[PDB]
Symmetry: C2
Subunit: 409 residues, 2 copies
């Protein structure tokens, strides 16, 4: 099973001053690189966390605030932040933004809005394994893969899109849309302009929706440039293009459950707004983050430093892997690298991938993600996260791996 790495991590987690031989966590896309910036801001600006505004208590007002349209000040701060992430190249109407309890909630809600039980959405592989639950479990909707391969850097092609559409037909499924992750989990790459145009042309042709999960939008730290699906729209189909966002991966606030749906379609906004009743964001949290994200000095510095620190860590992982003779898909975004260990497989099979994976868990004591867990069609790729560890622990992990490679290979 794909839960073996996590099971062993829970039983024997690494700790530098208590359990040095334990399992190092590199399987969770978690950003711990910039908390000092947020803590520093909170220290300087204690009011919002204290339920005060202009020296007055607003505890009661927030305690009572249960409106499914969200706190207006927070939605304004959110759309401003989304524009800033995109270099102010696109703007978002806060009336078209719907807050949800994380992107987990946003993605499920989009599926409920756009597809009926027994229908399907297309998703490029490899993809975020959470989607197999989020998009399918309560919705009765199926996923049909758009297979991407390493030959062209795991990019979406017109051929793969057509092949997916015909697999859906073979499965007797009606396709309602395509959901992409831009930047990609697990590839760590930004979608290309050509891919975006191909996707837009395709959903135009098929009369379906395009949902772009842009949760990693603020984490593009090297060339080429991140391009939001909404930017390509500037240069019918307009009503069928939608965005999912969250503060979980850029700001590192997954516990606070801040997600968002953005749609140009008034009816989708209305339906999603009503559905948000099942997963609203705490008004306490909306207030705090409205204060934080309204501070333009903080947002500018946060994005800049997050880019700086993410880039430094990715480079350290890439360099560490290179010393064990291991290459990565050349990436520029996200909290992880997509790592090529095909040459370490016993054979070109997923059985071989799982053998290697288990050796890494048990002998190297690293938790990483096998590519088959992300539905990669090529055995031997792994997702390896870099944004949750101290630099020294990342270095230790690289040292362990090198010793492992030297011994068995």
């Amino acid at each position: 099973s794909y839960f073996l790495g996590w099971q062993e991590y829970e039983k024997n987690p690494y700790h530098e001053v208590h359990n040095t031989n334990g399992i190092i966590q590199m399987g969770l896309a978690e950003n711990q690189l910039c908390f000092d910036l947020l803590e520093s801001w909170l220290a300087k600006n204690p009011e919002a966390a204290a339920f005060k505004k202009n020296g007055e208590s607003i505890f009661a007002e927030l305690a009572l605030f249960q409106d499914y349209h969200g706190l207006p000040a927070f939605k304004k701060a959110m759309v401003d932040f989304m524009a800033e992430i995109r270099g102010n190249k696109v703007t978002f109407d806060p009336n078209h933004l719907v807050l949800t309890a994380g992107a987990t909630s946003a993605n499920e809600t989009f599926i409920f809005c756009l597809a009926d039980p027994g229908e399907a959405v297309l998703i490029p592989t490899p993809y975020y394994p959470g989607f197999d639950r989020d998009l399918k479990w309560r919705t009765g909707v199926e996923i049909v893969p758009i297979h991407c391969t390493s030959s062209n850097g795991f990019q979406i092609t017109e051929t793969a899109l057509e092949e997916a559409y015909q697999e859906a037909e073979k499965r007797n499924l009606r396709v309602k849309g395509v959901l992409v992750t831009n930047p990609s989990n697990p590839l760590g790459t930004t979608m290309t302009r050509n891919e975006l145009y191909l996707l837009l042309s395709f959903v135009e042709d098929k009369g379906i929706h395009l949902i772009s999960d842009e949760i990693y939008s603020g984490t593009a730290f090297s060339s080429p440039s991140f391009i939001s699906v909404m930017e390509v729209l500037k240069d019918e189909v307009w009503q069928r293009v939608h965005v999912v966002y969250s503060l979980s991966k850029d700001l590192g606030l997954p516990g606070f459950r801040v997600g968002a749906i953005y749609s140009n379609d008034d009816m989708v906004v209305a339906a999603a707004t009503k559905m948000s009743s099942f997963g609203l964001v705490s008004s306490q949290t909306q207030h705090l983050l409205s204060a934080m994200l309204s501070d333009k000095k903080l947002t500018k510095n946060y994005i800049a430093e997050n880019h700086k620190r993410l880039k430094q860590r990715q480079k350290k992982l890439v360099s560490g892997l290179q010393k064990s003779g291991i290459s990565c898909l050349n990436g520029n975004a996200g909290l992880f690298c997509w790592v090529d260990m095909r040459h370490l497989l016993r054979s070109n099979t997923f059985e071989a991938e799982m053998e290697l994976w288990k050796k890494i868990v048990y002998e190297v004591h690293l938790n990483i993600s096998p590519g088959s867990s992300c539905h990669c069609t090529e055995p031997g790729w792994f997702r390896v996260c870099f944004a949750n560890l101290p630099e020294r622990t990342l270095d230790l992990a690289m040292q362990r791996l090198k010793a492992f490679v030297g011994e068995y290979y």
Copy 2:
């Protein structure tokens, strides 16, 4: 439509020092009676809201806390509070408690866990109108009413339960359970021991589930005593009895989205835990409320004062209505009274009920809820809330009503 009262309230809301002739809100079950107690506690105990524990920052730890089992300290505080509400007559295993984003989320999640699309749950009428969305919209599950009438104080009878079960059969629906509200919204009454035994006998016989939405459990302020479904269980079917709870109505914190599912069935707990991923409680809020609810002085005083203040307001509403010759169903819980205006109807029809309701909105400028919106089978009942207004505003509303009654009657 039933949204007319709210539409007019939004357009012309009462304000004592800006809009004295505006519409007074008595249609929203909102508890504003005890915020001073919470504000006072926050003033004395500023640490949790400040992301500190024992003088150390725990911001990062909370920011990262996204576990669907919930914060252990908070689940412990919650089960302790639930026991305290029930006079410590029953205890709850925190491992069997699942946090959700409000009771809205908890109720929907229970339906997803217990019933498939096209199946049904039985609900005593009158009931909370939100259920028509919460229980049905995304679940594909139907509601079949268990009709209660004023002849016996709107209590559930064996005959009504059997009639409901046979309506489900006529509708070709498989019944999966019964969902009750104890204490009741909109009746303002606590369920009787005989009703609870009848319900338990019935779901035992039919092999179905009993879900008790006990969101108003802490608001029972006069005799007879509140009896939790879990208390009657003390004196097979045990695995099929479940509880929904929330901090929205007792503590008046609907904006914070704190709901809970409690089940004795390990498999229901596991499924609901996984489903909670779509509607987790903010870790910021879990931490704050864990601190608050862990303070046994606060919880004891809060329950005592909430009972005191709720009772005083209910008595004021009852007395005010009596002066217009209007009686209520004798109640003892909740944030509202169930008011008998049958004698003010033009005729014994729901058309007459709606005529009266609209006159109250437009001529008396009060927003109250017509009983047909709660699926009451007898025209002429209304829900009138009392816990959101200043005493003087409640008094004003009663004055307006008396003038209206005197004029047209």
